[PDB]
């Protein structure tokens, strides 16, 4: 008789940086994905949201983070780019939904909100749902780095600079990725039933 806490992830004051993206696990609850049917932009792969109310799952995962508007298209199966290669990867066989909404009013400020970071480069591409939170400065030359960028010493993360007067593709977007997992265990997350 417990309702699923989807509203807690959608209405959180605080979203994670994409390189250190947040995952909530959701289990043992009645779900109403009419929430996901209700300036938001949703794309479901493999299911229909109205049909989701007729399904049960073992767990549901809610991944959330903030990215740039012109990067939202990389949160899709089979995509490649800056964010999908190095920050958040969806598997090609992805069953789930991507919801993204403009967050300019909350995540921008005139002096620049620099509090969201993203990864610039990586030793290999991210596997699906892999999360790399390394922040150690990459040492390229013989000289050690000591936490600060310099010659031959590269910070792997960079801040977005979000300002409200930027164009849409450069102002901040909040995004949640709902996965629906089903495995050799009883299914706890059912629909309105």
């Amino acid at each position: 008789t417990n309702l699923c806490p989807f509203h807690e992830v959608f209405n959180a004051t605080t979203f994670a940086s994409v390189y250190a993206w947040n995952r909530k696990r959701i289990s043992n609850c009645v779900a109403d994905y009419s929430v996901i049917y209700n300036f938001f932009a949703f794309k479901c792969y493999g299911v229909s949201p109205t049909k989701l109310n007729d399904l049960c799952f073992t767990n549901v995962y809610a991944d959330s983070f903030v990215i740039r508007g012109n990067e939202v298209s990389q949160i899709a199966p089979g995509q490649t780019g800056n964010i999908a290669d190095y920050n958040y990867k969806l598997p090609d066989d992805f069953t789930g939904c991507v919801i993204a909404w403009n967050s300019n009013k909350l995540d921008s400020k005139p002096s620049g909100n620099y509090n969201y970071l993203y990864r610039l480069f990586r030793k290999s591409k991210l596997k699906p749902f892999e999360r790399d939170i390394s922040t150690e400065i990459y040492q390229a030359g013989n000289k050690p780095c000591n936490g600060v960028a310099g010659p031959n010493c590269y910070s792997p993360l960079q801040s977005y600079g979000f300002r409200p007067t930027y164009g849409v593709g450069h102002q901040p977007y909040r995004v949640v990725v709902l996965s629906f997992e089903l495995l050799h265990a009883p299914a706890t997350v059912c629909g309105p039933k």
Partner: antibody, heavy 123, light 111 residues
Framework: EVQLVESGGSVVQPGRALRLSCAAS????????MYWVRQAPGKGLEWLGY????????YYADSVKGRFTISRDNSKNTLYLQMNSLRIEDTAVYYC????????????????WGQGTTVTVFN | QSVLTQPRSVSGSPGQSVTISCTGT?????????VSWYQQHPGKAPKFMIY???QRPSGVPDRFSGSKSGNTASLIISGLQAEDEADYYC??????????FGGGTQLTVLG
């Protein structure tokens, strides 16, 4: 700062083969994906291709895919362009350049270039 | 993927602004924000000037800036200095880990 020195350009007959070298100073070479770019006299830049820092991948412009081979020897700090079945169209300056960022990077730019090596193809 | 089209030549007087255009297609410049710019002086290697359409790498003056609109990217140089007389190439991702250079633009700083 890292220095790149291209070598191996020469006057060659059409149809022969030629291997270009590109040697990097210091030890920074193993961390960076390298590129090849060419420029025909008085013409614009032509992106040729790329090899990753660890050799994991190699990419090629369509104009030379299947005819040119890019490789690298991280032991010797040196990048290679193997040119086969040379054409008149191949006469140009040949540049090697390092990615702006180390490791898998790719989406930003080529920030350090060599001075170039000239290839001239006539019978 | 086809060359990116830049005006063959363009000119401006010292202290003025000039903008170099760079028009491609839906599958390059109109698809991605990985648009970069290079500056090349006589007999020299190109120099890296803009990436991500308008970010600048280390040591490039703020008088260099970029913008993108549909399939056209632009490079804008305000307060022209004499050192700026050079050729300028745009550069764009074309998908599938391929990069493409534009045709090149001769900028002459009138002296």
């Amino acid at each position: 700062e890292v220095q790149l020195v291209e070598s191996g350009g020469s006057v060659v007959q059409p149809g022969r083969a030629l291997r270009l070298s590109c040697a990097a100073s210091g030890i920074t070479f193993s961390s960076f994906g390298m590129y090849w770019v060419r420029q025909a006299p008085g013409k614009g830049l032509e992106w040729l291709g790329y090899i990753a820092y660890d050799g994991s991948d190699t990419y090629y412009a369509d104009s030379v895919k299947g005819r040119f081979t890019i490789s690298r020897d991280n032991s010797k700090n040196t990048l290679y362009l193997q040119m086969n079945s040379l054409r008149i169209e191949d006469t140009a300056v040949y540049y090697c350049a390092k990615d702006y960022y180390p490791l898998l990077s790719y989406y930003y730019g080529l920030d350090v270039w060599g001075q170039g090596t000239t290839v001239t193809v006539f019978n | 993927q086809s060359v990116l089209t830049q005006p063959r030549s363009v000119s401006g007087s010292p202290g003025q602004s000039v903008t170099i255009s760079c028009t491609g297609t839906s599958s390059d410049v109109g698809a991605y924000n990985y648009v970069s710019w290079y500056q090349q002086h006589p007999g020299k290697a190109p120099k890296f000037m803009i990436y991500d359409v308008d970010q600048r790498p280390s040591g490039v003056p703020d008088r260099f800036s970029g913008s993108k609109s549909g399939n056209t990217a632009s490079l804008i140089i305000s307060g022209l200095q004499a050192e700026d007389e050079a050729d300028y190439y745009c550069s764009s991702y074309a998908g599938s880990y391929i990069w493409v250079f534009g045709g090149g633009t001769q900028l002459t700083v009138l002296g």
